[PDB]
Scaffold this active site. Structure first.
Site, PDB file in Angstrom:
ATOM      1  N   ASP A   1       0.829  -1.240   0.067  1.00  0.00           N
ATOM      2  CA  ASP A   1       0.158   0.050   0.063  1.00  0.00           C
ATOM      3  C   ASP A   1       0.911   0.643   0.751  1.00  0.00           C
ATOM      4  O   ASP A   1       0.727   1.959   0.584  1.00  0.00           O
ATOM      5  CB  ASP A   1      -1.268  -0.253   1.390  1.00  0.00           C
ATOM      6  CG  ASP A   1      -1.673   0.923   0.878  1.00  0.00           C
ATOM      7  OD1 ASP A   1      -2.141   1.490  -0.144  1.00  0.00           O
ATOM      8  OD2 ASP A   1      -2.662   1.662   2.035  1.00  0.00           O
TER       9      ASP A   1
ATOM     10  N   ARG B   1       0.447   9.272   2.271  1.00  0.00           N
ATOM     11  CA  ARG B   1       0.236   8.648   3.362  1.00  0.00           C
ATOM     12  C   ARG B   1       0.855   7.925   4.292  1.00  0.00           C
ATOM     13  O   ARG B   1       0.834   7.623   4.954  1.00  0.00           O
ATOM     14  CB  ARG B   1      -1.732   8.524   3.632  1.00  0.00           C
ATOM     15  CG  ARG B   1      -2.258   8.094   4.894  1.00  0.00           C
ATOM     16  CD  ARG B   1      -2.478   9.516   5.238  1.00  0.00           C
ATOM     17  NE  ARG B   1      -2.999   9.540   6.727  1.00  0.00           N
ATOM     18  CZ  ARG B   1      -4.512   9.040   7.151  1.00  0.00           C
ATOM     19  NH1 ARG B   1      -5.572   9.153   5.517  1.00  0.00           N
ATOM     20  NH2 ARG B   1      -5.123   9.573   8.174  1.00  0.00           N
ATOM     21  N   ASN B   2       1.439   7.273   3.680  1.00  0.00           N
ATOM     22  CA  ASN B   2       2.204   6.306   4.423  1.00  0.00           C
ATOM     23  C   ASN B   2       3.546   6.625   4.361  1.00  0.00           C
ATOM     24  O   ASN B   2       4.656   5.858   4.554  1.00  0.00           O
ATOM     25  CB  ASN B   2       1.899   5.357   3.365  1.00  0.00           C
ATOM     26  CG  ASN B   2       0.783   4.542   4.417  1.00  0.00           C
ATOM     27  OD1 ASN B   2      -0.035   5.359   5.153  1.00  0.00           O
ATOM     28  ND2 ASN B   2       0.111   3.584   2.936  1.00  0.00           N
TER      29      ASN B   2
ATOM     30  N   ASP C   1       4.394   1.723   7.298  1.00  0.00           N
ATOM     31  CA  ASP C   1       3.310   0.873   7.149  1.00  0.00           C
ATOM     32  C   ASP C   1       2.353   0.201   8.306  1.00  0.00           C
ATOM     33  O   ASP C   1       3.046   0.096   9.492  1.00  0.00           O
ATOM     34  CB  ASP C   1       3.713  -0.455   6.470  1.00  0.00           C
ATOM     35  CG  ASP C   1       2.708  -1.662   5.845  1.00  0.00           C
ATOM     36  OD1 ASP C   1       1.917  -1.423   5.396  1.00  0.00           O
ATOM     37  OD2 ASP C   1       2.403  -3.089   6.485  1.00  0.00           O
TER      38      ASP C   1
END
Ligand SMILES: COc1ccc(-c2oc3ncnc(N)c3c2-c2ccc(NC(=O)Nc3cc(C(F)(F)F)ccc3F)cc2)cc1
Length: 281
Positions: free
Chosen positions: A144, A148-149, A162
């Site tokens: 992912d 945002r990460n 993560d």
């Protein structure tokens, strides 16, 4: 996996509890002040993740994965843990004081000119590619990868890291739709590989060069979206891109995973764009 307490174990009495940084469905994170965590006589702000057998297992798994990954500038790094009986299980990682990259870039839209500049944006891109090349070398897949990460630390260093939140306090920006970062093969066939991370990276590049916009603006993400994606439909260039950076996005979005660049290739290429960006005459 084994746990070398000599290397990792940190005394709970040398952690001063600070402000809550978030509780999710599983595991709460807090700021803390750690004395001597890097062996020098300094107090350092750190982020501490702390707590069923399932929950204990998950946090212990995160600890072991972080030990496995090991250290890189562009991955959130493990600093220590508190595992011995008699207090809570705690995993201690580097604190990133400026929060996630998506929110940060959003906050800087009126403070950008070719202030943030293309140098900053290309630098962030390069750093994320470096962190991903590292993760790939450890035989990890992120699954992912999105702005945002990515967290922002001091001196513009970015770090790869993560559904739960009270709807009264939910604001636009507090959620994202992970489907928008998934490679066609991950959508259609739940296939995750390092090459599907490269697709995601292309989306992350788009986020950077839109200064934190949501991907596929106004597009409904349904079976039709997915159909068009497999057929070759792609996002248009974002508002702050260079032609070279949009070409790189298109390359990352190759429909055939094996024809997308590798992270090593992206590091070489982005490093060249970055160097060219700050050259004389
Ligand atoms: C509600 O849930 C949460 C609330 C706050 C935070 C948080 O907030 C922060 N603020 C500042 N600095 C930080 N390091 C954090 C952190 C914070 C806490 C933990 C981590 N841990 C990891 O990134 N772990 C990890 C990282 C990877 C990697 F991406 F590197 F590959 C893979 C597997 C992993 F488990 C990274 C950042 C994380 C979760």
């Amino acid at each position: 996996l084994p746990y070398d307490a000599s290397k990792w174990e940190f005394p709970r009495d040398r952690l001063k509890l600070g402000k809550p940084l978030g509780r999710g469905a599983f595991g709460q994170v807090i700021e803390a002040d750690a004395f001597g965590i890097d062996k020098t006589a300094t107090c350092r702000t750190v982020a501490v993740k702390m707590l069923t057998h399932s929950e204990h297992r998950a946090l212990m798994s995160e600890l072991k994965i972080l030990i496995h990954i090991g250290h890189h500038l562009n991955v959130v790094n493990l600093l220590g843990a508190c595992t011995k009986p008699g207090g809570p299980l705690m995993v201690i990682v580097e604190f990133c004081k400026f929060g996630n990259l998506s929110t940060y870039l959003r906050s800087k839209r009126n403070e950008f000119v070719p202030f943030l500049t293309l140098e900053h944006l290309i630098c962030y891109s390069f750093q994320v590619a470096k962190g991903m090349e590292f993760l790939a070398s450890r035989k990890c897949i992120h699954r992912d990868l999105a702005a945002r990460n990515i967290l922002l630390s001091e001196k513009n260093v970015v770090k790869i890291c993560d559904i739960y939140k009270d709807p009264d306090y939910v604001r636009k920006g507090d959620a994202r739709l992970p489907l928008k970062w998934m490679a066609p093969e991950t959508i259609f066939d739940r296939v995750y590989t390092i090459q599907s991370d490269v697709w995601s990276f292309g989306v992350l590049l788009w986020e950077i060069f839109s200064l934190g916009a949501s991907p596929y603006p106004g597009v409904k993400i349904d079976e039709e979206f997915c159909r068009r994606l497999k057929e070759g439909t792609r996002m248009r260039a974002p508002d702050y891109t260079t032609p070279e950076m949009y070409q790189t996005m298109l390359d990352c979005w190759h429909g055939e995973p094996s024809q997308r660049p590798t992270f090593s290739e992206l590091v070489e290429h982005l490093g060249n764009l970055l160097q060219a960006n700050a050259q004389q005459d």
